[PDB]
Each structure stands twice: as structure tokens, then as C-alpha cells.
Design an enzyme around this catalytic site. Structure first.
Site, PDB file in Angstrom:
ATOM      1  N   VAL C  92       0.821  -1.204   0.000  1.00  0.00           N
ATOM      2  CA  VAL C  92       0.000   0.000   0.000  1.00  0.00           C
ATOM      3  C   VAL C  92       0.859   1.260   0.000  1.00  0.00           C
ATOM      4  O   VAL C  92       1.770   1.401   0.816  1.00  0.00           O
ATOM      5  CB  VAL C  92      -0.943   0.033   1.221  1.00  0.00           C
ATOM      6  CG1 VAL C  92      -1.785   1.301   1.214  1.00  0.00           C
ATOM      7  CG2 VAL C  92      -1.830  -1.202   1.240  1.00  0.00           C
ATOM      8  N   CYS C  93       0.563   2.172  -0.921  1.00  0.00           N
ATOM      9  CA  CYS C  93       1.292   3.430  -1.016  1.00  0.00           C
ATOM     10  C   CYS C  93       0.527   4.553  -0.324  1.00  0.00           C
ATOM     11  O   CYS C  93      -0.368   5.162  -0.910  1.00  0.00           O
ATOM     12  CB  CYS C  93       1.552   3.793  -2.479  1.00  0.00           C
ATOM     13  SG  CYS C  93       2.703   5.166  -2.713  1.00  0.00           S
ATOM     14  N   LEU C  94       0.884   4.818   0.927  1.00  0.00           N
ATOM     15  CA  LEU C  94       0.208   5.840   1.717  1.00  0.00           C
ATOM     16  C   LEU C  94       1.232   6.707   2.447  1.00  0.00           C
ATOM     17  O   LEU C  94       2.290   6.223   2.849  1.00  0.00           O
ATOM     18  CB  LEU C  94      -0.763   5.193   2.707  1.00  0.00           C
ATOM     19  CG  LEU C  94      -1.896   6.067   3.249  1.00  0.00           C
ATOM     20  CD1 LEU C  94      -2.719   6.636   2.107  1.00  0.00           C
ATOM     21  CD2 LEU C  94      -2.778   5.256   4.182  1.00  0.00           C
TER      22      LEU C  94
END
Lengths: 157, 109, 158
Positions: C92-94
Site C-alpha cells: 500500500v502506497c500511503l
């Protein structure tokens, strides 16, 4: 609801005096008037041998609520100990000593003391109660056992 | 004697009534006499006066039952039989055991 | 055995067990020994309703480095998902999942799972992690949401 409790503590005592594990102490404290306080006990646990806890005798106080034995005792080390599962207040963090968990009214004072002695050399990773002891225990166990041996020597008669 | 005085202390604790428990007499000779009323009945009220000579629990304690909700004829049976497991629990503090043995029990079952 | 990490993770566990959002799962995995692995977690995130992502229960694994909580955990979808901000590995790219950005050690596992759930229906235009999903999301959102609904139905539990 104190009747079932005071009686139960009284079943605990004579069974303890008739037979109890070696090196273990469990004595109800005595009131100034001359009565007996069964709800409050002064106990001692010996360190298992072959371990860094060896030669040591470690003192703890046991407190019973009025709804005992359906509630567990509060077990507090005095003086407080250097252990991953012991709070800075000396309170012991154990699964069987908490009601919503593995506490049973069938559990004897003997079983409790033995379980704590087992906990001494087998800390529980899932119950951090002391920052210093837990962190050192994980990081450098050689140094940890160094602290345990010094502490054990401190409480050897 | 340590076992005896511990028993006395424990009994004095077990009961936290108002009129529970009393030490009628203390002495180096003849020993200790005390009274307990413990309450029991639920269907078809007890005063137990124990005497502990300085040989107890190696010796037999002196007992006596008053319980005027009960008749008196039983008290002789009951004193001549609370005497039994008193001989079973011999050589060790038996008072607590007898006490809690008989609110279970009115020569029942 | 990282002391700081294992201690924090054990309190995250007990806090999660005492209170956590509905439909969310966060359970530490089991070691080959049969013990508990606090450094590795098996989690599940339900789609928020009012959205295309629902009836779906999407499984994600949470992994912690020894310097946790000074680093954020690595949150990886297994199996990998079709999302503009999710890498082909399911990672996940957060921003809050990045140390140099908005990661803080105070952030709880609960907050992380909620933030990812928020990210599901609200993609970030500035963080492309999957090329095709991103491009489709920008230009033709009708097909994007078509794929999203098909995926949401595919990952609906029994």
C-alpha cells in the site's frame, strides 16, 4: 460474601501447612487486635536452580477480594523485582491472575505461586509490564541474566 | 502451642459477626475455653462451647451444645458424636472442621 | 527479538482486542514453532458503505521491522488488489506509511487500517503505484469502477 472467602482461605492454609513445595512460604498476616488476616498473605518464592534466579528467595504479598475465590488474588512483589512481567509497583502480570482470562475458582494458592515461579525464568513476551527489564531481556540477555544474578544475590539470606 | 494459637486466630477471623466468638477463659493449666455460635438450619441456631486442654490437638477437646430451637436429647448424641471425626482429625486443629462439618449436617443423611 | 517493537505490538494487540472497528480483523500470525508472531499480522478490511468497494472483505498482511514503531509497518495486500495506489506486490502506497512523510510512532494499527480503507474509495492522484489502474482511474472511471465492483464481489466472504 466474605464467608465463602474467609473459609476458602482457611482451606488453603492448613493444606499448605500439612504439605507445600520446598522453599515456598505462604503466611496470612496477623492483625494488631490479635485476629488473623486471611485476605492478606505474606509469601516468598524460591528461584529455580540451574537458573540465574538460583539461591534467591523473592518476597511477594497476596491480596484477596471479598468475592474470592471467583476473583483472583492481587500478587505484588515487595520489594518490586527486575522482571519483564512485573510492574514498577511490583504487581505480577499473569494470565491466571485476571478474572476475564484463565482465572478459575479451582486454582489453589500453591498453583499460583508455582506458576509465578515458572514465570520467573520464562517471561511472557505478550505481557510487557516493565520497560527496562523487557527491553534488556530482548536486546542483550547475557546482561539481563547479569542483572538477575545480582538481584538474586541481593535477596539470598 | 503454635498450631493451637494459629487455629484460635483463624477461628477468630473466620467469624466477623457481632456475637460469634468469645474466649471464655485462658490459662497455662487447663487451657483455653471458647464459645462459637454458628448457624445452619434450613428445614427439619447453635452454641458450641469448646475446651482446649494444653494437650489438644493430641488430646480430645471438651464440647457442649446449646440450641433451644433444637431439643436437648440430641445434644448428648451430638456431643457424643461431634466427638468422632474429632478422633479422626486427631493430632491436628479440628475445630474449624467440626464447626463447618455441622451446618452441613444435623445428624442428616 | 526487538524489545521496543514487541512491547508496542503486544499493547496494540490488547488494545485491538478490547476495542476495534466493526468488520475489521487484526490477528498476529503463527510461527512454525506454534508461538505467536507479533512482527507479522493477518488483517482484513471491509469496504465502507456508500461505496463501490463493498460486500468485499479484503485481506492484507501487516509486517513490522525491528525498529518499529520508528518505522511504519509494511502493509501488503494478499492477494494483490486492483487500485491506483496499490503496488503489483499488494503493498500500500500511503503517506502515513512512509517514515520521511506522515508516519508517526503514535499511530495505531486501528488508525492504519482505517486510513487504508479510506484510501480504497478515495485514490490519491499524486501516488501512482499501479500503472494501468491509475491510468484507467484518471481517464475512464466507468470501467475503473466496473472492475472495482467485480473485484468487490469476488472478495465477498462466505
Amino acid at each position: 460474601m466474605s464467608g465463602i472467602a474467609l473459609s476458602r482461605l482457611a482451606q488453603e492454609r492448613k493444606a499448605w501447612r500439612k504439605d507445600h513445595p520446598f522453599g515456598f512460604v505462604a503466611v496470612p498476616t496477623k492483625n494488631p487486635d490479635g485476629t488473623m488476616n486471611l485476605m492478606n498473605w505474606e509469601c516468598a518464592i524460591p528461584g529455580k536452580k540451574g537458573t540465574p534466579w538460583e539461591g534467591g528467595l523473592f518476597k511477594l504479598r497476596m491480596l484477596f477480594k471479598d468475592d474470592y475465590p471467583s476473583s483472583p488474588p492481587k500478587c505484588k512483589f515487595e520489594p518490586p523485582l527486575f522482571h519483564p512481567n512485573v510492574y514498577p509497583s511490583g504487581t505480577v502480570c499473569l494470565s491466571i491472575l485476571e478474572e476475564d482470562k484463565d482465572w478459575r475458582p479451582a486454582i489453589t494458592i500453591k498453583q499460583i505461586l508455582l506458576g509465578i515461579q515458572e514465570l520467573l525464568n520464562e517471561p511472557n513476551i505478550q505481557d510487557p509490564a516493565q520497560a527496562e527489564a523487557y527491553t534488556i531481556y530482548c536486546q542483550n540477555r547475557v546482561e539481563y541474566e547479569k542483572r538477575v544474578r545480582a538481584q538474586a544475590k541481593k535477596f539470598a539470606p | 502451642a503454635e498450631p493451637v494459637q494459629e487455629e484460635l486466630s483463624v477461628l477468630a477471623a473466620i467469624f466477623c459477626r457481632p456475637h460469634e466468638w468469645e474466649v471464655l477463659s485462658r490459662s497455662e493449666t487447663d487451657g483455653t475455653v471458647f464459645r462459637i455460635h454458628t448457624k445452619a438450619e434450613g428445614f427439619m441456631p447453635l452454641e458450641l462451647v469448646f475446651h482446649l486442654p494444653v494437650n489438644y490437638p493430641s488430646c480430645l477437646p471438651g464440647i457442649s451444645i446449646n440450641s433451644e430451637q433444637l431439643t436437648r436429647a440430641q445434644c448428648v448424641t451430638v456431643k457424643e458424636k461431634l466427638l468422632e471425626q474429632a478422633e479422626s482429625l486427631l493430632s491436628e486443629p479440628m475445630v474449624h472442621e467440626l464447626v463447618l462439618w455441622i451446618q452441613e449436617n444435623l445428624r442428616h443423611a
